[PDB]
Design a protein around this ligand. Structure first.
Ligand SMILES: [Ca+2]
Length: 109
């Protein structure tokens, strides 16, 4: 059973990092990829930036094309439009926190 969650965060340096499969991983300032195998859920918070939304597409389509040999379908959603399939895995959505600053220019990135 494939269930993975990626946090997609940054501005000039955007990274996708695997995090625990939980609503507690989400915030409204980043994008998240909930990978369910033959379906990949691309979710972006209201305060996600354009570079995160772009990279979320690259990651979801890269899983689809490179890991799943094109077989999977990517579905785009946002807060309040989550597909039933997402809620079946994560449970009902709680109130979500804000993100943190994306730029960390002096820190190893
Ligand atoms: Ca962000």
């Amino acid at each position: 059973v494939v269930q993975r969650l990626f946090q997609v965060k940054g501005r000039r340096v955007v990274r996708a990092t695997e995090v625990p499969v939980s609503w507690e991983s989400f915030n409204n300032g980043d994008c998240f990829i909930l990978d369910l195998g033959n379906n990949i859920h691309q979710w972006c918070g209201s305060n996600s930036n354009r570079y995160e939304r772009l990279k979320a597409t690259q990651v979801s389509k890269g899983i689809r094309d490179n890991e799943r040999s094109g077989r999977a379908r990517v579905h785009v959603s946002e807060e309040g439009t989550e597909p039933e399939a997402m809620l079946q895995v994560l449970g009902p959505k709680p109130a979500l926190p804000a993100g943190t600053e994306d730029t960390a220019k002096e820190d190893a990135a």
